[PDB]
Amino acid sequence: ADSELVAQWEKVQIKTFTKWVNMHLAKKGRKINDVTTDFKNGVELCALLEIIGETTIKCVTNPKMRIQMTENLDKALRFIQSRDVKLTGIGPTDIVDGNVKLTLGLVWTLILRFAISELSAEGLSAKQGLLLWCQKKCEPYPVKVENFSESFKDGKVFCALIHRHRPDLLDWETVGEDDRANLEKAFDVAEKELGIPKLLDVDDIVNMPRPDERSVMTYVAALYKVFSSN
Ligand SMILES: [Ca+2]
């Protein structure tokens, strides 16, 4: 049983990555509907990189020629590899033409670079550090953190992550066997008391046999920032 739910994970990852883009685009009054269509001219990708890159690359803000959109992504793809990112096989025509697997692949490289990179340690993938991070925060709690898919489905781990850091924000006696209740618990606390938009749609977690791994990691990257000892 994979083919229909692989299509479902793609829908979900589009929504989560879109909402993750908007999180940064909102810091300047910008917003997009759909990451698979809204980077096709390069403007909002250049926009996003300026915010999270702390640079002013000059893009053509209302491209009327296909040439200008393509050149927009030239400047975008240039800057990304200036920040030590390996672009597997993504060129500008792949995003101007609106390819979904390569655009999601691009955005995931930005999430990995600008949201999770701090957790890679010379032989530890950024994914490895993040999970080991959660695992050590969740030792006190009756939860297993083995992955970023099934371990996060029922909501207890999102609550432990917040509770271990800020127990005034969340009561551990109120988490139970109702996944939707726990998920709404954590996402409404993080959204009101930590500054984190609801990048995960509760429907998309409760509904599927397990969540999209890269979506969950993106929300978890956001929790990781909000808890910085320094
Ligand atoms: Ca929904």
The DSSP secondary structure of the chain, one letter per residue, reads --HHHHHHHHHHHHHHHHHHHHHHHGGGT---S-HHHHTTTSHHHHHHHHHHHT------SS--SHHHHHHHHHHHHHHHHHTS---SS--HHHHHTT-HHHHHHHHHHHHHHHTSGGG--SSS-HHHHHHHHHHHHTTTSS-----SSGGGTSSHHHHHHHHHH-TTS--GGG--S-HHHHHHHHHHHIIIII-----S-HHHHHHSSS--HHHHHHHHHHHHHH----
CA 37–ligand 1 middle distance (angstroms)? 20
Residue entry with tokens 């929504």: 15
**Resolution (Å units):** 2.5
Taking the C-alpha atoms of residue 174 and residue 182, their distance in angstroms, rounded to an integer, is: 8
Name residue 117's amino acid: S
Q: Residue 29: which region, alpha, beta or left (left: phi > 0; alpha: psi -120 to 50)?
A: left
Class of domain 120-230: mainly alpha
CA 8–ligand 1 middle distance (angstroms)? 12
**51 Cβ contact list (under 8 Å, min separation 6):** 24, 25, 27, 28
* Domain segments of the chain as ranges: 1-119, 120-230
For this PDB entry, the determination method is X-ray
The two structure tokens encoding residue 196: 């984190």
Task: Tell me if 204 is assigned to a ligand binding site.
Answer: no
Burial-class residue 193 by CB neighbours within 10 Å (0-12, 13-18, 19+).
middle
Asked if residues 24 and 48 have their Cβ atoms less than 8 Å apart, the reply is yes
Taking the C-alpha atoms of residue 151 and residue 179, their distance in angstroms, rounded to an integer, is: 12
CB burial readout 91-108, b (16+ within 10 A) else e: ebebbbeebeebbbbbbb
CA-nearest of 217, 212, 184 to 198 is 184
CA 56–ligand 1 middle distance (angstroms)? 35
CA 13–ligand 1 middle distance (angstroms)? 13
Task: Tell me if 203 is assigned to a ligand binding site.
Answer: yes
Evaluate whether 1-119 and 120-230 have a shared fold: yes
Residues flanking ion ligand 1, Cβ below 5 Å:
201, 203
Task: Please list every residue in the chain followed by a chain break, i.e. its C lies more than 2.5 Å from the next written N.
Answer: none
The two structure tokens encoding residue 195: 């500054």
Superfamily of domain 1-119: Calponin-like domain (1.10.418.10)
Asked if residues 89 and 78 have their Cβ atoms less than 8 Å apart, the reply is no
Taking the C-alpha atoms of residue 55 and residue 213, their distance in angstroms, rounded to an integer, is: 30
The two structure tokens encoding residue 159: 């609550």
